[PDB]
Amino acid sequence: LQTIGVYKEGIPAGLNFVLLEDKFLVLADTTVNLNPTAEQCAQIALQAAKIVEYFGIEPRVAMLSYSNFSGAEGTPRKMKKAAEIARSLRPDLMIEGDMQADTAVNPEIMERLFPFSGLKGGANVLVFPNLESSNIAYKLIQQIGKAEVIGPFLTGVRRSANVLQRTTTVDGIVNSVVFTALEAQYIKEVLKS
Amino acid sequence: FGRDYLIPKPFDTRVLLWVAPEVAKAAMKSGVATRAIEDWDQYRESLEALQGPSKVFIRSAINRVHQNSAANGGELPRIVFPEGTSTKVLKALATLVEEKICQPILLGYPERVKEKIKALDIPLLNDVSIVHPSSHPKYFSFVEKLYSLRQRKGINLGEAERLMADPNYFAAMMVNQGEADGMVSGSSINYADAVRPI
Amino acid sequence: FGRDYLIPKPFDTRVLLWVAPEVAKAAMKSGVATRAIEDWDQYRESLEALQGPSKVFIRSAINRVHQNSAANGGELPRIVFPEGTSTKVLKALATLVEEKICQPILLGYPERVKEKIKALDIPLLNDVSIVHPSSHPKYFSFVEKLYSLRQRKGINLGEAERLMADPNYFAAMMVNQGEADGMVSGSSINYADAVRPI
């Protein structure tokens, strides 16, 4: 961070992949920012969407909360306002908040209870309101969900850069390198333009 | 009026207003009067005002209600009273209606309110419209207009359904939609609790 | 059961629970069997268990309700359900009683709930206590006890009468006083809105 830095409007953020039979879900930010502000949550999400768009998949984003659209003072307002910012920045993308978790990932719950929601087809990008929720969520899916989880990976830096954990296994080190290489190629291509 | 009530009670405030103008009327018709009262309404008005600085103010006010009412087609403003079974509200409606101020619309069970109307022996308003929320035709039209207003403020479709089931929110929505011209409530509930729906 | 229902629907989860144990019972009685099932109840329990690692848990639970139930006189915990016209609560209760878990007390207008019991073709529970708050004898004893618990927290004698008229508060107060052993609601209301009176 002290040497490479981030690009314009960047935020340093740790991201995971949850792998299912069909889709995968993207989790963030799980290592870096302790209690991210609304502006920050919208940026975490936007980056996560450039990343999912890279794999040719339509990104669907939920600002997670303990509430279904309360806008109430506190976390819900931060996340609701967060989504509002994120749409302000990329209007082609399906982004919403605030909403609970299950309300996110399941398009059926969404159409039954909040048919007004701009998010349909179930979320594929989950932004957390803070670090407690995201680290506990990802490590809990990994241990109980019995769906497979890779990461965490680093995002938002000017150049291809990535941090491992000490607990990282060899598999982890090699796929982590893969992403590093790719983002590097993506950097070169952004350069070409 | 009957075998046990033949003459108005000694402490009846109406007494002055009813007898005095007829005494002046007789003193004039028989011609022993030396100064003529023409506007009978004005005489009575000043008779009322004659006791209470507020009354004259309120009397001026009502005069202004009638003034712009009769200038816009003789129409009376529709006013919603969510508390249709409220004793105090019924008793007020009583004195109100002979004043032709507004068209009162009460809320509650169509019969539990005429039950309370007949219970207070106040037949002045046997015919003022009384509406139960859950029964009104525009009811779903209403629950959705609330929904869009509060679906992002912690309300899903179900809670907006019961919330429009509350006479208060019902009054307010009625007003908002022009299905009523005004509302007044809270003779039963706390100022805060009653203001929140509005 | 009738002319339009002669056989259990193909998809009854009870089928197995009812048929398989009697098949085994027959095979043991007819002597073609080489292993004997003794704990019949256990057998059925395992049969339910077949789908549901949670289902097994609630069954452990129920066996354990029956266990201290039968130790204190077979007495069942009295439980009040304030939302007595809730489709879901009623339908749940149905399955609840034949498991002899609790003695259900519903809240609302007695005939407006027996209407919904007859409306749901759910005769399982034709004999459960149905109580209107305002009508119950301890009502006033209750509004007084709410009064002193909350008069210095924003409640006059009137507001306590009208809040005790809310089935929720009526329920909770039933519980606090020992007129019931517990309560459950929030099948109709927001989590918060339903947790506060408690």
DSSP for B76-104 reads --EEEES-TT-HHHHHHHHHHHTTT--EE
**Residue range(s) defining the domain that contains residue B149:** 56-198
In a domain? residue B98: yes
Interface test with A, best of B147, B149, B156 (most A CBs within 10 A): B156
In a domain? residue C22: no
Give how many domains chain C has, as a whole number: 1
- The dihedral built from the CA positions of residue A117, A118, A121 and A127, taken in this order, carries a sign that is negative
Hunting for tokens 């005769």 — which residue is that? Answer: C123
Partners of residue A72 in chain B, C-beta under 8 Å:
154
In a domain? residue B35: no
Chain B residue closest to C155 (CA)?
B190
- CA-closest candidate to residue C197, choices C156, C149, C140: C149
In a domain? residue B125: yes
Is the bond into A76 cis (omega within 30 degrees of 0)?
Answer: no
In a domain? residue B84: yes
Q: Is C189 on the interface with B (CB under 8 A)?
A: yes
Q: What tokens appear for B172 in the block? A: 């307010």
DSSP letter for each residue of C77-95: -EEEES-TT-HHHHHHHHH
Instruction: Report the DSSP pairing between strands C182-183 and C103-107.
Output: unpaired
Residue B156 has its nearest CB partner, among A72, A80, A113, at A113
In a domain? residue B89: yes
Interface test with A, best of B143, B147, B148, B152 (most A CBs within 10 A): B152
- C132: CATH: 3.40.50.10950
Question: Phi, psi at residue C187, to the nearest 5°?
Answer: -85, -10
Alpha carbons A50 and A186: distance in angstroms, whole number:
11
In a domain? residue C63: yes
Whether residues B153 and A69 touch (CB distance < 8 A) is answered with yes
Residue B159 has its nearest CB partner, among C154, C159, C190, at C190
DSSP letter for each residue of C90-123: HHHHHHHHTTT--EEEEES-HHHHHHHHHHTT-G
Q: How was this structure determined?
A: X-ray
Q: In what order do the strands lie in the sheet with A148-155?
A: A94-99, A60-64, A125-127, A24-28, A13-19, A148-155
Interface of A with B (CB under 8 A): 67-72, 80, 113-114, 116
Partners of residue A71 in chain B, C-beta under 8 Å:
152-154
CA distances from C48 to A21, A179, C16, C43 (A): 29, 48, 8, 9
Instruction: Report the DSSP pairing between strands C129-131 and C103-107.
Output: parallel
In a domain? residue C3: no
- CA-closest candidate to residue C167, choices C96, C118, C113: C113
- For chains A and B, what is the number of CB pairs under 8 angstroms? 21
Resolution in A: 3.7
Q: Is C162 on the interface with B (CB under 8 A)?
A: yes
Alpha carbons B183 and B167: distance in angstroms, whole number:
11
